[PDB]
Design a protein around this ligand. Structure first.
Ligand SMILES: Cc1ccc(S(=O)(=O)NC(=O)Nc2ccc(S(N)(=O)=O)cc2)cc1
Ligand SMILES: Cc1ccc(S(=O)(=O)NC(=O)Nc2ccc(S(N)(=O)=O)cc2)cc1
Ligand SMILES: [Zn+2]
Length: 256
């Protein structure tokens, strides 16, 4: 029962997940003046036209929009990546207030939320094998700031009251994740980990520079979700983010 409380939050995780103190933990602060342009980076290719979303699940930590990943529909290629990575799910991390919520920071700036689109390397056959490899996953990170509404997000916001508590799910077909992307695909990249237990060091992070804007009313509905299950004391699902971890022996590269 790791979580985000004072009793089971990020400072406690290492007792059951010792890799929490590892050499390649995520997220990190992105120091823009230390990140270096890398002309070796190939163009980023986000091919989401044939995505098949399935369902939305409150897993007690966040909510995941899940995709059919039984073939190469929605894939991520290029950039720092070797080969093809299949979209399996996306989720967010967000704050109790607009001044915090993201996992990555940018010159110590916290955004209100962060979107994670999670992909696994098809050369390993399935997600479970992919998370045993140092290049098994690619996660596309996108910051959210509060301002104008994001039309592409409203369908997500409107289904949240049907998955308020842990373990609830709902059908969520025909959702196009292309409506959650910013205009620019300029990014930073570095080798890292999952940001929740099991904290496996298997991820190529690709963090877009340009945030998307969402409205106050949209993120307010995120904050009405619960960490708890039905019939249990209500604990609002807020501040489900891990803070920045030591960069150690890593270089963040800029595509721009
Ligand atoms: C009912 C059903 C089951 C399986 C599929 S599928 O096309 O094989 N897709 C699939 O398994 N997707 C999927 C599986 C696990 C996860 S998860 N649990 O890592 O969020 C996330 C996404 C499709 C429909
Ligand atoms: C060995 C193993 C594999 C998979 C799981 S799981 O719980 O089904 N999957 C899982 O945790 N997926 C996952 C976790 C964190 C992130 S994130 N936030 O780095 O984008 C993205 C995705 C648990 C244990
Ligand atoms: Zn995440």
């Amino acid at each position: 029962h790791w979580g985000y409380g004072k009793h089971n939050g990020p400072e406690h995780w290492h007792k059951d997940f010792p890799i929490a103190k590892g050499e390649r933990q995520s997220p990190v602060d992105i120091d823009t003046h230390t990140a270096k342009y890398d002309p070796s980076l190939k163009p980023l290719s986000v091919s989401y036209d044939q995505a098949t979303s399935l369902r939305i699940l409150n897993n007690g930590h966040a909510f995941n929009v899940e995709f059919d990943d039984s073939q190469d529909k929605a894939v991520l290629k290029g950039g720092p990546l070797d080969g093809t990575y299949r979209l399996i799910q996306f989720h967010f991390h967000w704050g109790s207030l607009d001044g915090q919520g993201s996992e990555h920071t940018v010159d110590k700036k916290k955004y209100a939320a962060e979107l994670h689109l999670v992909h696994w390397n098809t050369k390993y056959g399935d997600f479970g094998k992919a998370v045993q490899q140092p290049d098994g996953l690619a996660v596309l990170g996108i910051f959210l700031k509060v301002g104008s509404a994001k039309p592409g997000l409203q369908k997500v916001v409107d289904v949240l009251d049907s998955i308020k508590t842990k373990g609830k799910s709902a059908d969520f077909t025909n959702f196009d994740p292309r409506g959650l992307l910013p205009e620019s695909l300029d990014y930073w990249t570095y080798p890292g980990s999952l940001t929740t237990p099991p904290l496996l060091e298997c991820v190529t992070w690709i963090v877009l520079k340009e945030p998307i804007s969402v409205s106050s009313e949209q993120v307010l509905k995120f904050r009405k979700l619960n960490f708890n299950g039905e019939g249990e004391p209500e604990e609002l699902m807020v501040d489900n983010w891990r803070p920045a971890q030591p960069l150690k022996n890593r270089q963040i590269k800029a595509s721009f």
